[PDB]
Paper text:
Here, we identify an evolutionarily conserved hexapeptide sequence as the major aggregation-prone region (APR) of gastrointestinal peptides of the glucagon family: xFxxWL. We determine nine polymorphic crystal structures of the APR segments of glucagon-like peptides 1 and 2, and exendin and its derivatives. We propose that the pH-dependent changes of the protonation states of glutamate/aspartate residues of APRs initiate switching between the amyloid and the folded, monomeric forms of the hormones. Our results highlight the dual role of short aggregation core motifs in reversible amyloid formation and receptor binding.
Crystals of APRGLP1 grew only at a low pH (pH ≈ 2, T = 37 °C) where the N-terminal glutamic acid self-converted to a pyroglutamic acid (pE) via a spontaneous ring closure. In the structure of APRGLP1 the hydrophobic residues (Phe, Ile, Ala, Leu) form a hydrophobic core, while Trp and pGlu participate in H-bonding with each other and water molecules. In the crystal structure of [name], the ring-closure of an N-terminal Glu residue (resulting in the formation of pyroglutamic acid) makes the N-terminal more hydrophobic by eliminating the charge frustrations linked to both the Glu side chain and the protonated N-terminal amine. The crystal structure of APRGLP1 provide an example where pyroglutamic acid built in a β-spine amyloid nanostructure can be studied. Based on our current results, we propose that the elimination of the charges by ring closure, significantly contributes to self-assembly, compared to sole side chain protonation of Glu. This might also be the reason why we observed the presence of [name] in the crystal state while the parent hexapeptide, EFIAWL, did not crystallize despite forming amyloid. Thus, cyclic pGlu with quasi-fixed dihedrals would be expected to function as a gatekeeper of amyloid formation by twisting the backbone structures away from that of typical β-strands. The glucagon-like APRs (APRGLP2 and APRGLP1) show an extensive contact surface (Sc = ~0.80; Area = ~160 Å2) along the extended, linear backbone of high complementarity, while exendin-like sequences (APRex-4 and APRTc5b) present generally smaller values (Sc = ~0.65; Area = ~110 Å2).
Author numbering: 1 to 6
């Protein structure tokens, strides 16, 4: 998975 929280 690809997960991002900016």
């Amino acid at each position: 998975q690809f997960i991002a929280w900016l």
